[PDB]
Amino acid sequence: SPALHRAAAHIHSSPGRSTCLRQTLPLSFVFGPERSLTQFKEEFRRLHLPGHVLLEDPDSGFFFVAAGFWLIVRVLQDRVEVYAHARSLIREDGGPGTECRHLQQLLVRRVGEICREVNQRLLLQDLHDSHVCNSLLVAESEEDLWRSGYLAATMQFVPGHFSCDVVWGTVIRVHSRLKMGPSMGVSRAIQALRSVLNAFSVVNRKNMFVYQERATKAVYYLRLLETSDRHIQLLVHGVGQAGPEITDELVRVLCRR
Numbered sequence: 376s377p378a379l380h381r382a383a384a385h386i387h388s389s390p391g392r393s394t395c396l397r398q399t400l401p402l403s404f405v406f407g408p409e410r411s412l413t414q415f416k417e418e419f420r421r422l423h424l425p426g427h428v429l430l431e432d433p434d435s436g437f438f439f440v441a442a443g444f445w446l447i448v449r450v451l452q453d454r455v456e457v458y459a460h461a462r463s464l465i466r467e468d469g470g471p472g473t474e475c476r477h478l479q480q481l482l483v484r485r486v487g488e489i490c491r492e493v494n495q496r497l498l499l500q501d502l503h504d505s506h507v508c509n510s511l512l513v514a515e516s517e518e519d520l521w522r523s524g525y526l527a528a529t530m531q532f533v534p535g536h537f538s539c540d541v542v543w544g545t546v547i548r549v550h551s552r553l554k555m556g557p558s559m560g561v562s563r564a565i566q567a568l569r570s571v572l573n574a575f576s577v578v579n580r581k582n583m584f585v586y587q588e589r590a591t592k593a594v595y596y597l598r599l600l601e602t603s604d605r606h607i608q609l610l611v612h613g614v615g616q617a618g619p620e621i622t623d624e625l626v627r628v629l630c631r632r
Contacts (some may be wrong), residue, residue, distance in 0.1 A: 376434035383437070383447055386458040396459045396479055400486035403536060405497055405528035408452040418489055419450040422479060444471055446478065457482060494528065494537035495614055499594045503587050508580035511537035513596065513612075520582060541610035542595060542617055545626060549606045560606035567632045584625075591618045597625075 386395050404411060419438055423429040428443040431450075440446045444461040459475060467473035498512035511528070514535050549564060556563025563580060577583040582594070586596070587594040595613030602608040611621055 376432045376437070377439045379432060379439060379447060382445060382460060383449070383456075383458050386460055387456075393474040394461055394464050396464050396475055398457050398479060398483065399456075400455055400483060401453075401534045402455070402486070402488075403494055403528050404453060405494070405525045407527075410497075411493070412452065414493060415450055418493075422485060422489055424478075424485065444475070447524070448482075449625065454596045491536065492614070494532070495539050498537045499585075499587075499614065501546060502577065502585045503594050504597075506585070508577045508583060508585070508596070509537070513538055513580055519579070519581060523579065539596070539612045539614060541598075542613040542615060543611045543622070545607075545609045545611075547607040547609075547626075547629070549604075554605050562601055564605070564607050565599065565601070568599060568629070571574065571628060572631055586621075588618060588620045591620065593617055593621075595621060605622060 386392075386397060389395060390397075408415065417434075420429075424440075426443070427440045429438050430441055431438050436450050438448045438450070445459070447458045448462050449456040449458075449466060457479075460470045460474055461480070463470050463472060464475045465472045467476070476521070498509050502508055502512065511532065511534055515523075549562060553562050553564055555561060556566050566583075568582070569576065572584050575584045577585055577588040577596070582597070582599055584597040585594050593613050593615065595611050595617055597609060597611055599607060599609040611617060611625075615620075
């Protein structure tokens with residue numbers, strides 16, 4: 376720990392050195408470190424890179440990279456500092472220069488991904504607790520707009536930053552009795568889905584279902600669009616690949632319906 380502190384002090388005291396590359400990636404904090412300090416510690420102790428082992432010193436909390444050149448990441452309340460030291464950080468002709476550049480790019484990408492994952496997890500937790508879908512979790516459509524501290528993230532991040540891609544998709548051809556439901560030009564599949572899953576329907580997000588997994592603890596969202604022949608075309612957007620809880624149970628329920 377004293378050696379790591381001395382190395383960090385030496386790196387920070389020599390800006391612009393060709394043998395050092397220091398970058399800072401601020402995260403999109405929402406509730407500050409009150410609910411993120413444990414999350415920040417977990418990310419520091421878990422988020423790593425292939426080809427190396429990240430060891431966190433219990434004395435100071437600084438993370439060091441070991442083979443499985445020095446690279447350290449500081450875990451503060453609201454600031455992240457990366458200190459890199461090498462014999463030659465600009466020698467790309469077989470030296471560690473190109474490797475250091477690639478490592479810095481990968482670290483920046485990982486920091487962005489970690490911030491996005493933290494935002495998505497916060498949005499999912501808020502949706503589970505309050506049954507409300509935030510603007511960051513899903514872009515407000517025209518229909519959603521017509522049907523309608525933590526402000527730091529909203530003021531610093533545009534909508535869609537915490538949005539999650541469609542984890543899975545499904546296409547089922549509706550029968551000849553579901554071309555148009557009670558509404559003219561609109562199938563009854565939406566009405567059937569609403570009747571089936573009103574217990575997990577988002578008030579602020581129409582045709583959206585949020586339900587945390589019993590084991591995987593994955594609360595994803597559903598988007599069933601009338602794509603033509605008013606068939607069924609649904610996309611389940613979650614943090615990751617959902618398990619059997621949402622893979623086939625919903626499909627079987629809709630089939631029975």
